[PDB]
Each structure stands twice: as structure tokens, then as C-alpha cells.
Amino acid sequence: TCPFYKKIPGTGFTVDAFQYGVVEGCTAYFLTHFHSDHYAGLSKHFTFPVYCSEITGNLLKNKLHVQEQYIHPLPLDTECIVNGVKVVLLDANHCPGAVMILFYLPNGTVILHTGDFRADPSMERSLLADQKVHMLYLDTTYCSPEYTFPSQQEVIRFAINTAFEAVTLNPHALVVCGTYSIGKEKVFLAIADVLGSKVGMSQEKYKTLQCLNIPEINSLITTDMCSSLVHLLPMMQINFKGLQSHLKKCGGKYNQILAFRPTGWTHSNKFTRIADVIPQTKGNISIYGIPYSEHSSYLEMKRFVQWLKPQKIIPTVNVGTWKSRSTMEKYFREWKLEAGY
Ligand code: NI
């Protein structure tokens, strides 16, 4: 049955709640972003109103074939009325099209649902600064102090400099980047830009990217693999067997692979600086795991919450075990005593 942390009190609304069948009393289903753990259940046969960003609504229509008449895209940073309730969508700094949702309840309560987010000081200057938030439905994916990671900018600098050096030393090396969902597009686009190449990919992944309103995308991506020296493959194929196989298919055009796996976190971060990352190598194949995250680090999350000062926090991730839930609640209390709210 639908869990309570997917339901918005004082409304008929749910958030990211498409796999429970007809939720009793639900008048509007919001979708924060196009990741499968959140959209699971949507299809061309869904006949209730879905509220989302423009980009998410492009992906709904084109990838899942949801009918247009049930897709209700909203502009960002704009006060809108849904079934008599004021709402605002804000940029979540997650994947393309991903939003946070502010709900202004008829009784005066204000609720923020972060969806999935990577907290940033730029959010301290959005429409969130303009009123008090009483309840926060928080993406707690990395809510424990061991989760540190570098900025996205530092990680992309490492990736660009590594690829540029490799291919200038060996003009016959191929660069491969893994993916399994939307998100993290800067990794492969930034490398193709420094190399003077388009990114080559499957027809299905090219279609997905053409839904994202990314400026000058026709200039950076292609389905012609022959004309490209940066290839995108499914994340499952980013291993020595899968890469050796791919290299066979390129017909002697290339004699080396440099591959990137943008993971969220890996425990090499507790010790290792970004400067100190090394690949796994077998033969003429090297694989780099880079810590490119689209979720808040522990410190990023803590700063956002200590700035917002919510009256009540509802975690939406890691809620399945009693030790996880109790540990998160103890961090929330620390933050509140340290900050004075
Ligand atoms: Ni997500």
C-alpha cells in the first residue's frame, strides 16, 4: 500500500506514487523526475492527471507513450493553482527535468518535497527564501557523515584532462562512458567537447536525449558510431569482457579503450582525493570509477536544512530499517540543537 511519506496532508495529492494502483482519494499525481524507481507504474493506459516539469512531460509522451491529455507540465519558479491549491516547482539540481515542489496548504501550512536533489547554496536565493516552510519531505540518500565527495566541477575537470591526455598520446584510443538513466550528461558531453567529437549512442538513448531541451544537442550527439570517438554504452557493459567485445566491433579503428563509470559514492572517497584516483587496467583497457553525484553530500544536506529551519522532517530514502531511521533522526536533532531552531 502507498507509504505515508508519499502523501501530502490536507490535499488529495501524492508524489512519485505510480506503482500502487489507484491510490484512494488521490486527485493529482505529481512526478518529480524521470527515474524508474519514481515513475514505476506509468504507461499509455494511465488516465489520471500527472503534474511535472516540461522536460519530464516530454519523456512521459515520447518514452512511455502517456497520452497528452493527462500530462500537465508546469513552468518553473511560477505560482500555479492545482485543484485549488497553490504550488511552485523549483530546480532540484538532480537530473534534467528534476524538481522540488512547494505546496501552500489552505490552512497556512507550507510543505517542501525535495524529490531527489543535490542541495546547493543557490537554492538559498530562490522563492524558498520568501516564506517559512513547516514540513520538509527530504532526500536522505547520503544522510551519514562518511559520505563526502568533490564538486561536480572538480570531477569534470579530472575527466576532461584524463581523456584529453590519453587521446593526444594515442590518437587510436576510444573513450567509452557508461549510463543507465538520464542524468550525468556533463560527463560524456564535456569529454566529447575537449576531443572535437560527437558522442555516439544507440537510437533509444539518442531519442531520450532529444527530449531534454539541452542547447545545441544536435551539435554534440549522434547515432553514427563510426564518426565518433566517444561512445555511450549501458552501464552493465562497462567491464573488461563487455569492453573487449565492443573493441572487436570497431573493426581495427581503435587499439585501446579508456572507460568512465560515474558512480554515486564508493568508499575510496573516505581516503582518496580526486587527484589520487587511478583506474583498473587489463591489457589495453582501463576503467575509471569517478564520484560524480547528483545527490547531496552529508555536509550539503546539513547546510540546507540548518538554513531552512523546518519544524518537522520526513525522510524519503533509507526508511526501510529501524537502525537507518533512528540514526537519521539523531542527525536531525543534532542539526537543530547546533543551529538553534
Ligand atoms: Ni533520482
From Swiss-Prot:
It comes from the Eukaryota. Induction: During mitosis. The mRNA encoding this protein contains an internal ribosome entry site (IRES) in its 5'-UTR. This 5'-UTR generally suppresses translation while specifically promoting expression during mitosis, when cap-dependent translation may be impaired. It is found in: Nucleus. Coiled coil: none annotated. Changing residue 139 to N: Impaired nuclear focus formation, reduced interaction with PIAS and increased sensitivity to cisplatin. Expressed in brain, heart, kidney, liver, pancreas, placenta and skeletal muscle. Disulfide bonds: none annotated. Signal peptide: none annotated. Changing residue 295 to A: Impaired nuclear focus formation, reduced interaction with PIAS and increased sensitivity to cisplatin. May be required for DNA interstrand cross-link repair. Also required for checkpoint mediated cell cycle arrest in early prophase in response to mitotic spindle poisons. Possesses beta-lactamase activity, catalyzing the hydrolysis of penicillin G and nitrocefin. Exhibits no activity towards other beta-lactam antibiotic classes including cephalosporins (cefotaxime) and carbapenems (imipenem). Binds constitutively to TP53BP1. Binds CDC27, which is itself a component of the anaphase promoting complex (APC). Binds PIAS1. Belongs to the DNA repair metallo-beta-lactamase (DRMBL) family. This is DNA cross-link repair 1A protein. It comes from Homo sapiens (Human). The gene is DCLRE1A. The chain holds residues 700 to 1040 of 1040 of the full protein.
